[PDB]
Amino acid sequence: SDLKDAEAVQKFFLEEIQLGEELLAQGDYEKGVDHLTNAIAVCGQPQQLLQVLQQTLPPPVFQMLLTKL
Amino acid sequence: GXRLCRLLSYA
């Protein structure tokens, strides 16, 4: 890992979170969760992100997100 | 979209 490698991961992470958030605002719960799942997948320790998402999403939506990992 | 990213940085 150089700076390019981490930078591409940070950028993907940020794009997916943004898409996740927009799609959910539009009520496409399924695709929004897919995007959030991609952002979670690239974090070695997603606990804090998950706690923030639990505070931000409706419970059944957060639930769903947990089943996908 | 973006408020979620902002919220995540804050720490």
Which of B8, B9, B10 best tests the A interface by mutation, with the highest count of A CBs <10 A? B8
The first and second tokens of residue A9, run together, are 């991961």
User: DSSP assignment of A21-59, as one string?
Assistant: HHHHHTT-HHHHHHHHHHHHHT-S-THHHHHHHHHHS-H
How does A42-51 read in b/e, with b if 16+ C-beta sit within 10 Å? eeeeeeebbe
**Which of A16, A11, A21, A30 lies closest to A56 in space, CA to CA?**
A21
Cα distance from N-terminal residue to C-terminal residue, chain B? 20
Provide the experimental method for this PDB entry: X-ray
Half-sphere exposure of A64 toward its Cβ, with a 13 Å CA cutoff?
15
Question: What is the structure's resolution, reported in angstroms to one decimal?
Answer: 2.2
DSSP state of B2: -
Is there a contact between B8 and A52 if contact means CB atoms under 8 Å apart? yes
Closest chain A C-alpha to B8 CA, distance in angstroms: 7
Q: A1-69 has which fold?
A: Mitochondrial Import Receptor Subunit Tom20; Chain A (1.20.960)
Inter-residue long-range contacts of A35-38, CB under 8 Å, 24+ positions, other chains counted: A36/A65, A37/A65, A37/A68, A37/A69, A38/A12
Chain A positions touching B6 (Cβ under 8 A) are: none
